[PDB]
């Protein structure tokens, strides 16, 4: 199976992970928030939590969200790429 090594930024912390390169983002986001939170908790950092209603997304440096329905590969996210896990509140 193909994999991508990505850097995830969450709460000013970088976390390296190995992710399936072919799955849609949609099926990785909630799973990734849980691994993230495990790492933050070991660092005694407050886990990431849903301010009200809204959507967790993986974002480029400029705020651009990945498409939920496409893979990392299809979106040109490769080894060493960095993504920000961000919550968008619905207001």
Residue numbers in the entry: 17 to 107
Lines from the paper:
The ESX-5 type VII secretion system is a membrane-spanning protein complex key to the virulence of mycobacterial pathogens. Key to their pathogenicity is the secretion of a wide range of virulence proteins via type VII secretion systems (T7SSs). The ESX-5 T7SS is found almost exclusively in slow growing, pathogenic mycobacteria and plays a key role in nutrient uptake and immune modulation during an infection. The importance of ESX-5 and other ESX secretion systems (ESX-1 to ESX-4) for the virulence of mycobacterial pathogens makes these membrane-spanning machineries a key target for the development of novel therapeutics.
The ubiquitin-like (Ubl) domains of EccD5 dimerize and interact with the cytoplasmic domain of EccE5 at the periphery of the ESX-5 complex. On the cytosolic side of the central pore, the EccD5 Ubl domain formed interactions with the EccC5 domain of unknown function (DUF), which follows the EccC5 stalk domain.
